[PDB]
Design a protein around this ligand. Structure first.
Ligand SMILES: [Cl-]
Ligand SMILES: [Cl-]
Ligand SMILES: [Cl-]
Ligand SMILES: [Cl-]
Ligand SMILES: [Cl-]
Ligand SMILES: [Cl-]
Ligand SMILES: [Cl-]
Ligand SMILES: [Cl-]
Lengths: 136, 136, 136
């Protein structure tokens, strides 16, 4: 039957093209998937590398946090000691000033004694001289 | 031949649908690939941004590690100096205490001298008085 | 028409296979897309986790940078104070050395006074003895 054959020929030509369309899209799709896969692989390496770098920094930061706290405590000790030394130097200055006063007072006394010893000696000698001359 | 035509019609209708199936899957697949591509693009920007942020932190951490070590050495110098000042203040206190002792000893001596000078003067004057009165 | 039927049968068998090819590729592609999607999902969680970890470290680093600067200023204050205490201890030593000199000078004077007082007393007593014996 000619009419049936005719219809069938058109259908087959349609199907040929539709299969072709599908096959072509599936080939393009195959390429897009391989590209995305490639990109994901590079991402995987980058993400793993960022993990490693984070761990590295974290460890360094840990050491620094410890070092800061340690330094802070040591500075505080230093500051307390310096404050103690300031007090002790102040007290030493006070005592030094006192000694300066003490020494000056003493210097005045011993100078007065030196003076008086010599004055008294001359008065005694002069008085012995008169009595000696009077006896003779 | 009618029997051949009949078989052929069924085959064509089968093929039509199978092509259609393929085309439909390939269209869905095309959409999934575009979505994954979109996601990968956003991932790319995020990963690049994390790289930059890591570099930034790394540089800051570098400066802090240096600052910790520097501060640690400077504290150590401070502590050694403070320990030296403690010794020197201790020695000064020792010498101050000695001077306090020295001054007191001296204060006692010069006071005894002052006393004796005056006592000896009175004894001399009283003795001159007797001899003077005896001569007359 | 037999020749038309014959050609048509070959075409249908070709189309059957081409549709099949397409369908098979589209099924493989469907699987590759699901796998890439799965990988992207894991990447998403990793990238989000790296964001969080970066923020965490950044905050710690911030605190350390502050702690370094603070410690640096406090050390500097300590160092200036220690330098001041060194000067003050030096001056105290100078004054102490002066006092040592002052005390020794004074010790020599008061010892000479003690000596002279006693010498002068003996000379006076001996001279009174002669005059007394002469009067009688
Ligand atoms: Cl067909
Ligand atoms: Cl004296
Ligand atoms: Cl520090
Ligand atoms: Cl310090
Ligand atoms: Cl100090
Ligand atoms: Cl596909
Ligand atoms: Cl994909
Ligand atoms: Cl840090």
């Amino acid at each position: 039957n000619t009419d049936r054959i005719a219809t069938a020929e058109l259908g087959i030509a349609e199907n040929k093209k539709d299969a072709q369309i599908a096959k072509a899209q599936a080939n393009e799709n195959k390429d897009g998937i391989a590209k995305n896969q490639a990109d994901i692989q590079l991402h995987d390496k980058k993400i793993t590398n960022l993990g490693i770098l984070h761990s590295m920094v974290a460890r360094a930061v840990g050491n620094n946090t410890q070092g800061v706290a340690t330094n802070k405590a040591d500075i505080a000790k230093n500051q307390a000691d310096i404050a103690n030394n300031i007090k002790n130097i102040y007290e030493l200055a006070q005592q030094q000033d006192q000694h300066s006063s003490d020494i000056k007072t003493l210097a005045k006394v011993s100078a007065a004694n030196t003076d008086r010893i010599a004055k008294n000696k001359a008065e005694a000698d002069a008085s012995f001289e008169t009595l000696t001359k009077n006896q003779k």
